[PDB]
Amino acid sequence: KCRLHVNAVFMGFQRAQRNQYPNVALLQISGVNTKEDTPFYIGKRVAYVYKVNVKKGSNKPAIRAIFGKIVAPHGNHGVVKARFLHNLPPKAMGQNLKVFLYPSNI
């Protein structure tokens, strides 16, 4: 119908050389090449929507989502920190995450 989101790549969690903090996930929004273009996205919704091959004998949804918020910039290359309701699965590394346009501030 229409595209109302910008794809972001789940690069990985906030980490160090030999540590990992899955509370915060790092995202690379498409088209953001510097930390000065991040102020717009600080606070926008982010959704990790995935597909699960459920059986017809069940009632669980076949398309489930985990939502979260962009909270702060991370580095000088337009990388952001996102905190979700549940920590992202490491199986979803490098997949696409929808960066919505709400909560709007215009």
Binding site: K1, C2, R3, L4, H5, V6, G31, V32, D37, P39, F40, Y41, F100, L101, Y102, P103, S104, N105, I106
Partner: protein
């Protein structure tokens, strides 16, 4: 009298102690769970204490883009804000967009630079009563079963009032057709094309 903790209950002729009151002097009580009182109902003109502060770009007659919800990507015209709920009362004129007279919170919309103005829209009704009258409610809990068919008959019985309050849309539709390419723009969907970076887009 009985202690504050003592709530006597009936015994089905089971063994009871000598100190427990018998059934002939015990009257049962209904379990009470509702303590907090509901919201007060006031006049139809005074603004609610819990009223938002709309953005300065959101003014009556402007065109908004709905970027979330069922009508995501559609366009609407902001008439006025519901003083009893704080949510905008918009109409994406049904003859063009198909968006009915509905209520949306201001956080899910983008205020464009397009301005249709349109005064004398005759919004005398279309208040919190109207939105509470055309809302579809569930089947409660004690109303037997009444499955499926309860909701279907609701739409038919509330359809006529929905059309009746569409006297608001008659003025805007004529004004919308005045601006060239505006009727096509309003009737279409808002989409993010290639090179459309949201931090670069301006409305």
């Amino acid at each position: 009298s009985a202690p504050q903790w003592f709530v006597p209950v009936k015994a089905g002729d089971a063994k009871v102690p000598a100190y427990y009151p018998t059934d002939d002097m015990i009257q049962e009580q209904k379990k009470k769970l509702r303590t907090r009182k509901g919201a007060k109902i006031t006049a139809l003109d005074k603004p609610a204490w819990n009223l938002e502060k709309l953005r300065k770009s959101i003014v009556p007659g402007a065109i908004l883009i709905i970027v979330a919800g069922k009508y995501a990507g559609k366009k609407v015209v902001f008439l006025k804000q519901c003083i009893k709920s704080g949510a905008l009362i918009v109409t994406g004129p049904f003859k063009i967009n198909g968006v009915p007279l509905m209520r949306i919170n201001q956080r899910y919309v983008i205020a464009t630079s397009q301005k249709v103005d349109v005064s004398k829209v005759d919004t005398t009704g279309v208040d919190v009563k109207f939105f509470k009258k055309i809302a579809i409610k569930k089947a409660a809990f004690g109303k037997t079963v009444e499955e499926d068919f309860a909701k279907k008959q609701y739409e038919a019985k509330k359809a006529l009032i929905v059309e009746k309050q569409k006297q608001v849309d008659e003025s805007i539709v004529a004004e919308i057709k005045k601006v060239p390419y505006l009727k096509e723009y309003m009737a279409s969907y808002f989409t993010l094309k290639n090179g459309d970076h949201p931090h670069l887009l301006k409305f």
